Amino acid sequence: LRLALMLNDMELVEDIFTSCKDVVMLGRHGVFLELSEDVEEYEDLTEIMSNVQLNSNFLALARELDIMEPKVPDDIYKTHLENNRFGGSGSQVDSARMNLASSFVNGFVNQDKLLTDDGNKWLYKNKDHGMLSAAASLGMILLWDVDGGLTQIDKYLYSSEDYIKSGALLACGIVNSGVRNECDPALALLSDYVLHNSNTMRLGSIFGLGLAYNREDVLTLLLPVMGDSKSSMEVAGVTALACGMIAVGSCNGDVTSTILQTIMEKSETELKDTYARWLPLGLGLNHLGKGEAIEAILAALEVVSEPFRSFANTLVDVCAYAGSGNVLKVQQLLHICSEHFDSKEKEEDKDKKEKKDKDKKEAPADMGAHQGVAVLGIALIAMGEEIGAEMALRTFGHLLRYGEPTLRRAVPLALALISVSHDADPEVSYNSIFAARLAAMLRQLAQYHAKKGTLTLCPYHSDRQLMSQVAVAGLLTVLVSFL
Amino acid sequence: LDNQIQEIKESVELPLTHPEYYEEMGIKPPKGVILYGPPGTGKTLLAKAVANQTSATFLRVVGSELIQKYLGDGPKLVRELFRVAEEHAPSIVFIDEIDAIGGEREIQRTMLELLNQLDGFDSRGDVKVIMATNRIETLDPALIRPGRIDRKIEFPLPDEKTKKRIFQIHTSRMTLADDVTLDDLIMAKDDLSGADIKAICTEAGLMALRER
Amino acid sequence: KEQIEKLREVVETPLLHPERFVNLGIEPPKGVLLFGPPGTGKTLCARAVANRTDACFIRVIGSELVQKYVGEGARMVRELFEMARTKKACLIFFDEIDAIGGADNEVQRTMLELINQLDGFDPRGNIKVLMATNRPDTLDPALMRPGRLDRKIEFSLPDLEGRTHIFKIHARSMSVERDIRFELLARLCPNSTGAEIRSVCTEAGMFAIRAR
C-alpha cells in the first residue's frame, strides 16, 4: 500500500482488495487505506467498486463514514478534556479578533460541546469574515453525525444574512466529503454576474465542494466562475484551489484548456496581483502527480513575461520539483537564491521544506544568519513539519524574538504546527514578549492549535500569503490540513 | 529494597498512584524527603529513583558543576529547572551530588537562594524536590529545618553484594588470572555510584583489549 | 486544649476585639514564650499564618541576624521594624532566637540594639511578642525578659485531655494501617510530650517502617 502511495496505480488497490479480501485490522486498514490513497484512485476505486464492489463492503466500508466512524466515538470515549481551557482560555477573548481566535477554538476543538452552544449573539457580535469563520465553525465541529449536520446547520441555511448562509454552505462542505447531497441548493443558481450572495455562496460552496472532491461537470459549472472575474480575490482563490485539489495526483498532470484558460484569463487583466499569487497555487496543484512531465518547460516557454507570470513560472518550478536526486536544482537553488526579486526567493526558496522533507538532517542550514528576514521566515516555516526536537525549538528560540509583526505573527503558527510538557512554555514566552492584535490572535491560535499527501501540503503553501487584509482570514480558519 | 522506596515513591510520585489517601486522609506533605549516604553519588539513591521512572516523567540532575561553571549565572539554571518543574507538576525532580560547599562566598547565597526558592513562599504544593549528597556534615543546617519537615532516613555502609555482582557481570566475558581477587578491589574502592567501577571495568576491558 | 488557648488568645483575640482589652482592665497582653525541644515546632506558627484574617505578615528567622560584613543586621532589623511601622503595626515573628541570644561585639550591636528596640517604645511596644527557640540556656533574655515580655509556658506539653489536638495536627503521617480510624492513632498513645510524640512518629514510625 506504500507502493500504492508512490505508484498511484489503479490495479494495485484491486489486487490488494482481492488479496486483502481473501485474507480477512479491518477498520484500521480501511482508515489508513483512505488516508494513504489520493484523489485519483479513490474515484477510480469508487467506479470499479461502483461496478463490482465484491462484497458491497468496499464502497460500504471504503468510501466514507468509516474513516470517521471508528475515531469520533472512540475519541469522545477514551479522551476527557477539561473545561478550564474554555473558561480561562475561552474567557480572555475580546477586541473582535480574539473572538476570531475563538471561532478557531470552537471549530478546532471538535468531546465537549459547551462553547458550541454557549448561548447566542456570539455570531451577531462578530464581523462579516468572522461571520464566515463562525458559520463554518459549526461545520468544523461536525466532522461526524451526517444526520446531525443538517439539523444543526439548517438554522443558518437560507437565513436573513448573506454570510450566514454562505458560511453555512461552507459548513455543509466541511462536515462531509462523500455525501454530495448539499450541492444542488447552492450549485444550482450560481448566477449573479456582478456581486450578489451566490458569489459568497460560491466561495463557501466551491471551496467546500473542492474539499469534498478529473470531475468535468463541476468544471463546466466553474467556467462561468472564472469567466465572471469578480473583484473579490477568494473567487479565483477557491476556484483555482478547488480545481487544483480536484486535479492533484493526476496522470503526469495536464496542460489542458482549463489551466490554459485560467492562464489566458489570468494574463487578460494585470490587476490585483494577489490573483497572480494564488492562481499559480492552483496551477502548481494541477502540476502535482507528474513523473516525467515537461510542464515546467512548457510553462517556461509560455509564461515568460513580467515577474507576475514569471512568479507563476517559478511557482510551477516549485511544484514541479517535489523531490528526487537532482542536486543540479540545489546548486541552481543556491545560484538563483541571490535574486533581487523578494518573492521568488520566498516561494522558490520556500520549496526547501517540500523537496528535502524526508532527509531532515540537511534541512537546518545557515539561512537564518542572513539579513533577508524573509528567508528567516522561509526557514521558520520549513521547521514546522516534525515532532520539534531540541534543535528545531532551538531555532524557535532565536526566531521567536523579533520586532516585525509579520515574523512575530508567523512564529506561533509554525510553533503550533510543529507541536500538536513543553507546549505552554513558549506560549508564556510570547506573553513575555507582548505582555500586537495579530500576535495575540495568533498566539491564542497556537494555544488551541496545540491541543506525500497533498491534503497536508496545500493549505499552508496557500496560507503563505497571510500578510494582507482580513479577507484571507475567512479562509485561514477553514484549513483542512489540521488533524 | 521496597521499604525506603515506597515512602519516597508515594512522596514525590504522589499524584499518579492510589488517589484516595492524599486528600481523603488529609496528609499533604508537599516538601518531600532529603537523602544522604556516605557512599552517595546516586547508586542506591538512583536505585531509589528508578521506581519513579516506571510510569511518570523523570528529571535527572547530578552534581552542581553546571552552577559553578559560569562567571555570574548563579541559580538561574535552578530557576529554569523549577519553572520546567512547575510546568511538569506530575514529575519527579532528583538532585544528586550536592557538594557545592564541600567564589566561595557566592555558594552560600545561591544555596540560601536555593533554600528560599525550594520552600515556595508564594507557591502551593506543585512539584517535589529530592536532595542527595555524600556527607551530611558538610551541608549547613539551613537546608534542614525549612527543607526537611516530613521524614529523613540514614543510609548505612555500602553493599559489597551489589558491587560484587556488577563487577562479576562486567568481568564475566573478561579474562582474569587466579591471583586477581575481588575483596581487595571492592574494599579498596569507596564512594562510587557504580558508574566508576563500570568505568574501571571499561578502561580495564579496553586496557585488556589493547593486547587483543 | 489549654495551651493552644493560652497562645491563641494572644494571636487572634488582640486583633479581633481591641476594645475588649482596653476596657478589660490592666492592658492587652503581650505574648507567650515557646522554648524546649523542637518536636513539631514552626507547625503551629504556620497554622497561625493560615488563621490570618486580613493581611499575611512577614517572618524573620534568627539566621538573618548573623551575616558577613557586620553592620547590615542593624539596618535589617530597623528596616523590618520600619515595615512594621508602615504596615499599621504588622506582625513580627522571631524564629530560633538561640542563634544570637545567650551572650563578639559585632553581634552585641545587633542583639543589644535588638533589645534596645524591643524594650524601647520608639516604634511600638505592644503589638505582638513571640519567641520560638530550642534551648532555655539564654541568660540575657532570661534576665531582660520580665521588662516587657511575660507569660512563660511550656513549648507544647498539653494536659491529659489536650493531646488530641496535637494528634489531630499530627494525623498527617503516612498511615497507621488503613483509613478506618483516626482516633485509633489519636487516643492509643497518651502521656507523651509534644516532642516525645515526634519520637513516637520517628521511632514508632521507624518501627512501622522496619516492620517489613
UniProtKB/Swiss-Prot annotation, chain A:
Subunit details: Component of the 19S proteasome regulatory particle complex. The 26S proteasome consists of a 20S core particle (CP) and two 19S regulatory subunits (RP). The regulatory particle is made of a lid composed of 9 subunits, a base containing 6 ATPases and few additional components including PSMD2. Interacts with RPGRIP1L. Interacts with CRY1 in a KDM8-dependent manner.
Listed GO MF terms:
enzyme regulator activity
Expression across tissues is:
Found in skeletal muscle, liver, heart, brain, kidney, pancreas, lung and placenta.
Q: Which residues carry this modification: Phosphoserine?
A: S89, S91
Per the entry, what this protein does is:
Component of the 26S proteasome, a multiprotein complex involved in the ATP-dependent degradation of ubiquitinated proteins. This complex plays a key role in the maintenance of protein homeostasis by removing misfolded or damaged proteins, which could impair cellular functions, and by removing proteins whose functions are no longer required. Therefore, the proteasome participates in numerous cellular processes, including cell cycle progression, apoptosis, or DNA damage repair.
| Alphabetical UniProt keywords | Acetylation, Phosphoprotein, Proteasome, Repeat
* Taxonomy, superkingdom: Eukaryota
Record's Gene Ontology CC terms? cytosol; extracellular exosome; extracellular region; ficolin-1-rich granule lumen; membrane; nucleoplasm; nucleus; proteasome accessory complex
Establish whether keyword Cytoplasm is in the entry: no
* Record-listed N6-acetyllysine modification sites: K272
Start and end residues of the PC repeats are 133-166, 167-203, 204-235, 238-272, 281-310, 439-451
Annotated region (Disordered) at 344-366
A single BP term in Gene Ontology:
proteasome-mediated ubiquitin-dependent protein catabolic process
Entire protein: shown range: 266 to 804 of 908
Q: Basic and acidic residues composition bias: which ranges?
A: 344-364
| Family to which the UniProt record says this protein belongs | Belongs to the proteasome subunit S2 family.
- According to UniProt, the name of this protein is 26S proteasome non-ATPase regulatory subunit 2
UniProtKB/Swiss-Prot annotation, chain B:
**Which residues are listed for ATP binding in this entry?**
G37, P38, P39, G40, T41, G42, K43, T44
Q: Which domain of life is it from?
A: Eukaryota
| Residues bearing the modification N6-acetyllysine | K69
Effect seen on changing I130T:
In BKAH; uncertain significance; contrary to the wild type, it fails to rescue eye defects in Rpt2-null Drosophila
Per UniProt, subunit arrangement is: Component of the 19S proteasome regulatory particle complex. The 26S proteasome consists of a 20S core particle (CP) and two 19S regulatory subunits (RP). The regulatory particle is made of a lid composed of 9 subunits, a base containing 6 ATPases including PSMC1 and few additional components. Interacts with SCA7. Interacts with NGLY1. Interacts with PAAF1.
Main function:
Component of the 26S proteasome, a multiprotein complex involved in the ATP-dependent degradation of ubiquitinated proteins. This complex plays a key role in the maintenance of protein homeostasis by removing misfolded or damaged proteins, which could impair cellular functions, and by removing proteins whose functions are no longer required. Therefore, the proteasome participates in numerous cellular processes, including cell cycle progression, apoptosis, or DNA damage repair.
This one is known as 26S proteasome regulatory subunit 4
Curated annotation (Swiss-Prot), chain C:
Q: Where is the signal peptide?
A: none
Superkingdom of origin organism: Eukaryota
Which residues hold ATP?
Answer: G36, P37, P38, G39, T40, G41, K42, T43
Record's subcellular location: Cytoplasm
Q: What induces it?
A: Expression is not cell cycle-dependent and occurs throughout the cell cycle.
Q: How is it modified after translation?
A: Monoubiquitinated by RNF181. Phosphorylated. Dephosphorylated by UBLCP1 which impairs PSMC2 ATPase activity and disrupts 26S proteasome assembly.
Q: What family does this chain come from, according to its entry?
A: Belongs to the AAA ATPase family.
The annotated subunit structure for this chain is:
Component of the 19S proteasome regulatory particle complex. The 26S proteasome consists of a 20S core particle (CP) and two 19S regulatory subunits (RP). The regulatory particle is made of a lid composed of 9 subunits, a base containing 6 ATPases including PSMC2 and few additional components. Interacts with NDC80/HEC; this interaction is detected only during M phase. Interacts and SQSTM1. Interacts with PAAF1. Directly interacts with TRIM5. (Microbial infection) Interacts with HIV-1 Tat.
Report the protein's function.
Component of the 26S proteasome, a multiprotein complex involved in the ATP-dependent degradation of ubiquitinated proteins. This complex plays a key role in the maintenance of protein homeostasis by removing misfolded or damaged proteins, which could impair cellular functions, and by removing proteins whose functions are no longer required. Therefore, the proteasome participates in numerous cellular processes, including cell cycle progression, apoptosis, or DNA damage repair.
Q: What is this protein called?
A: 26S proteasome regulatory subunit 7
Q: What is the lineage of its organism?
A: Eukaryota, Metazoa, Chordata, Craniata, Vertebrata
Covered range of the whole protein = 181 to 400 of 433
